[PDB]
Structure 1
Amino acid sequence: SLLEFGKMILEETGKLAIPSYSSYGCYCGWGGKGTPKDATDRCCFVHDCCYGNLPDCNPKSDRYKYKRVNGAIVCEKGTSCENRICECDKAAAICFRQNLNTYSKKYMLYPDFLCKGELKC
């Protein structure tokens, strides 16, 4: 659920999910059209493709449990869903960190309008 995801993001990046990621570029915060603006934006994209491959699950709402082992995110075992969701979230979060040095305020609150067309995931 967004609760775990949003928390994941602050642990990895140091930024609050809200302002910093709720409306970044074309895919951050949700949306789904356009050509990803940058690296951070490419991760929201990939994260969206990840959620899209869990038809049997409720990604944005099911609570899953995860722990940090020696500074690394580890998805605890739960249902098939809670596990796959958690991995999607971990991948996005970690990515976010990896590209912090390219994070551009220039893309926060980006006009969803400017994004046109649907990329084949």
Structure 2
Amino acid sequence: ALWQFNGMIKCKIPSSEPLLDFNNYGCYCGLGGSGTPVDDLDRCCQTQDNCYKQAKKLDSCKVLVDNPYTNNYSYSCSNNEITCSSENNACEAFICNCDRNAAICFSKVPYNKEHKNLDKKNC
């Protein structure tokens, strides 16, 4: 979950401190999400939100109250690449992949310092 996701982002964007730079970005980067994403970074977050939401409709994820933000999985970072571990059971493997996709997206889009701390009246 989170602790793991923060590391995935640091794996790809080494200079970052994720919970500081990507927290409260746009309408999607943070808890919840509503409106239209303000940019590509925000669209990344929207997508991940939809993935988590999707992890929910899976029989494999039904029995894990811990929640994906805190549903712990195994992965690795070796020379800036993320690898989800085969040892992850069905649900965690799916959440892992959602987080890998997002950390990769984040590293491929521009950061607009105009959208952090964005007021939720724009969503």
Normalised TM-score (structure 2): 0.85
Equivalent pair of 1:22/1:30 in contact (CA under 8 Å): no
Task: Show CA shifts across 1:17-49 (max 9, x none).
Answer: 122111001101123111100010000000000
3-state SS of paired residue (1:48): helix
- Equivalent AA in structure 1 for residue 91 of structure 2: C
2:97 alignment counterpart: 87
* Count of paired positions: 113
Q: Does 1:106 align with 2:114?
A: yes
Q: Does 1:74 align with 2:90?
A: no
RMSD over aligned CA atoms reads 1.4
1:28 alignment counterpart: 29
3-state SS of paired residue (1:22): coil
Normalised TM-score (structure 1): 0.86
Task: Tell me the distance in 2 between the aligned counterparts of 1:92 and 1:107.
Answer: 18
3-state SS of paired residue (2:107): helix
Q: CA deviation at 1:72?
A: 2.2
Task: Tell me the distance in 2 between the aligned counterparts of 1:8 and 1:70.
Answer: 12
Q: 1:10 to 1:72 in 2, by over 3 A?
A: closer
Task: Tell me the distance in 2 between the aligned counterparts of 1:4 and 1:32.
Answer: 21
Q: Does 1:40 align with 2:41?
A: yes
- Equivalent AA in structure 1 for residue 106 of structure 2: F
- Equivalent AA in structure 2 for residue 12 of structure 1: K
Long gaps (5+) in structure 2: none
Which of the pair is proportionally richer in helix?
Answer: 1
2:20 alignment counterpart: 19
Q: Please, which moves more after superposition, 11-20 or 24-33?
A: 11-20
Q: CA deviation at 1:69?
A: 4.7
- Equivalent AA in structure 1 for residue 114 of structure 2: K
Long gaps (5+) in structure 1: 116-121
